[PDB]
Amino acid sequence: EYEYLVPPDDYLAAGVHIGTQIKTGDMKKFIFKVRQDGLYVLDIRKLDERIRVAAKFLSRYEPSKILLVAARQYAHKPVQMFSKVVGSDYIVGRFIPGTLTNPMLSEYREPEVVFVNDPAIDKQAVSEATAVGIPVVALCDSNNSSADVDLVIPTNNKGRRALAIVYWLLAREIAKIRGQDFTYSIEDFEAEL
Amino acid sequence: EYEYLVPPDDYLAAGVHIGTQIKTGDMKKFIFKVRQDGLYVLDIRKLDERIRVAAKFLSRYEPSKILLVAARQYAHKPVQMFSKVVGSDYIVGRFIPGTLTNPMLSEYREPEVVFVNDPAIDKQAVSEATAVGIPVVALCDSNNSSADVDLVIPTNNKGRRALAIVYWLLAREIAKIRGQDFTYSIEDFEAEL
Ligand code: NA
Ligand code: NA
Ligand code: NA
Ligand code: NA
Ligand code: NA
């Protein structure tokens, strides 16, 4: 029996397994099945394994050197709350071109690892981080595919609740490794509306 | 404008870009093109970027906590030479089931990261590492596909010289990150005839 970070039903209730109508070759290994309504379903066993791995991966960096990126609206709150807990830097909303490549921009930063919400939406950040040799972690849905993403977290990266539980779990596990008290609830990470 | 770790011609002479007659969905994003003879060609730009990232990541671990695994014969020497330089542990030849999951087994170890030569050949190690939450790094050829590999290094992982230059580069970059002198030639890493 596999031991999940949370009861399996919690993952399903959050809709992390709900993909899109599109499947990429890169994501096939994470797709459990395709629903009759054409929607692809992600493997929660794989998601759980990847969240654990990502938490360990990220705990190998000093907090301030971690940069989270997310233009997608429902990801802003989860990203900011994750940062509140982990101590990572973040950029939500429009990512300004040159933020990682132009030392003269006021927004310029030099993180050692970049974590984006969606490689398609946050493509500018992914491309720049890769051009500068910075490892890229990313949430990838069935429709995503990027040769520039180094560490993948296969999950619904669009749903309000799905994003809340994933960022919440990542922050929770990183805090555990760090021996930092964490009492936040999934609701605390969830975007309004 | 990209800057390779070594003259591009060196990568080609080693045949790292030469894949097999098969292409998985997992590897599609790394395939540059398909040759006249049916052989898929890997993207050396991505390989170079990935070797750089893997070296950085691995240098984030106490060397003794890194475990290299390789049953494939042409990978033994490269793996042993990499370990000589890096200080990592390794298991070449048959990987005994239970090595990462059975504490009573004499060969039992608790590495913090596992790096295998081929996820199909070294599937036992990949499966066990994943089952215990240990991040998995792997060399993946066009024919490979594994949801259990966390960090991928897209390259020919069968060729004698292909393996020598890849392990050589990784070791060189890790030593460089440490400052450790590195005077080995690619030949010093190549399996004998
Ligand atoms: Na989705
Ligand atoms: Na990248
Ligand atoms: Na707690
Ligand atoms: Na090959
Ligand atoms: Na794994």
Curated annotation (Swiss-Prot), chains A, B:
GO biological process, one term: translation
CDD domains, sorted: RPS2
Superkingdom of source: Archaea
TM regions (residue ranges): none
Pfam family, one: Ribosomal_S2
GO molecular function: structural constituent of ribosome
Keyword Chloroplast in record: no
CC annotations in GO: small ribosomal subunit
Alphabetical UniProt keywords: Ribonucleoprotein, Ribosomal protein
Family: Belongs to the universal ribosomal protein uS2 family.
Protein name: Small ribosomal subunit protein uS2
Gene: rps2
